[PDB]
């Protein structure tokens, strides 16, 4: 089975071509922390710690072109599938993990054995190591699950509220000419307030979710970075 379909970004691609044929400065980035990993001067890393900047920027642009514009009615999030997001996070996370593993430095994993020598190795430290190795994969799964669930829940809530507002607006506006007009005006004002609140909440939540999505990947990278001190 081969399905031929298209993304919902064609107009946005047209706008990108029109508005970015000439150069422009970028000064606001959703996830700026990918650019500033080191905060104490004289510290440097021999690992390619800035390799994630390009992927981070492209991912932010792609996910923003989809998620932020999805607030417009009838706009489609073409990639909104659980396993597709799993594939995306698998690519990024496993690629960086395999980059660290291909280094063939086993000492890098010494920190997985949690605790000190005082703690019993077999019954405490080894079980903590098992849990931490499990937690890495669980972090991957939780990242993709969080991204999927937030979008799904937000858009379900928006659709249901919009349906209710359409119903009351269309089939109960005649009460403005009736003696119970005050009740309808109260309900209508409440619906407008909830409409604005929901839109603001979704706008904030989309950007926050993208920030967290990139932060998880950068945290994976940072967990295995070692910094030398210049002398």
């Amino acid at each position: 089975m081969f399905l031929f379909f298209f993304c919902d970004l064609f107009w946005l691609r047209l706008l990108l071509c029109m508005y970015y044929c000439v150069w422009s400065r970028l000064c606001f980035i959703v996830y700026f922390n990918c650019l500033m990993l080191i905060f104490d001067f004289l510290l440097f890393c021999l690992f390619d710690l800035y390799l994630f900047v390009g992927l981070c920027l492209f991912l932010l642009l792609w996910f923003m072109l989809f998620n932020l514009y999805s607030l417009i009615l009838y706009y489609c999030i073409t990639y909104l599938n659980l396993y597709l997001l799993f594939c995306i996070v698998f690519l990024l996370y496993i690629a960086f993990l395999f980059l660290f593993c291909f280094l063939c430095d086993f000492f890098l994993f010494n920190n997985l054995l949690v605790g000190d020598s005082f703690m019993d190795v077999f019954f405490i430290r080894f079980l903590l190591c098992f849990l931490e190795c499990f937690s890495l994969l669980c972090r991957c799964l939780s990242t993709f699950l969080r991204l999927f669930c937030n979008l799904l829940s937000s858009h379900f809530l928006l659709l249901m509220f919009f349906d209710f507002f359409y119903f009351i607006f269309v089939f109960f506006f005649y009460g403005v000419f009736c003696y119970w007009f005050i009740l309808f005006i109260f309900v209508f004002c409440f619906c407008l307030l909830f409409y604005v609140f929901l839109y603001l909440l979704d706008l904030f939540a989309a950007i926050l979710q993208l920030f967290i999505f990139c932060n998880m990947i950068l945290q994976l990278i940072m967990d295995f970075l070692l910094f030398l001190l210049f002398v």
Partner: protein, 105 residues
Amino acid sequence: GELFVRPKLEEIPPADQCRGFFGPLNDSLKFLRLLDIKWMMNRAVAMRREYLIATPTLFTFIWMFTWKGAVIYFWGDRAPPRRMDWNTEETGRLPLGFKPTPAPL
């Protein structure tokens, strides 16, 4: 977190000081060191060779998370049924009177 420096040859405690599951496997019990997993873990921790405990675990998880998990899911053998459909070993043989083609020569 911080940089790791391998211990010097003089900073590594003797093997006799390591403890097993029950107690130290000193003289007359040295060959039991090979079989006692906890003694090997304690020895590795003592020699700062903790990776021997951590590297096999993580990799195993990765191997399960990446390659074997799906292999078991898609191609693994489920539990056998109560009434089993064994092979009668009658299928495949050519019928009587059939003239097979000659082999290459």
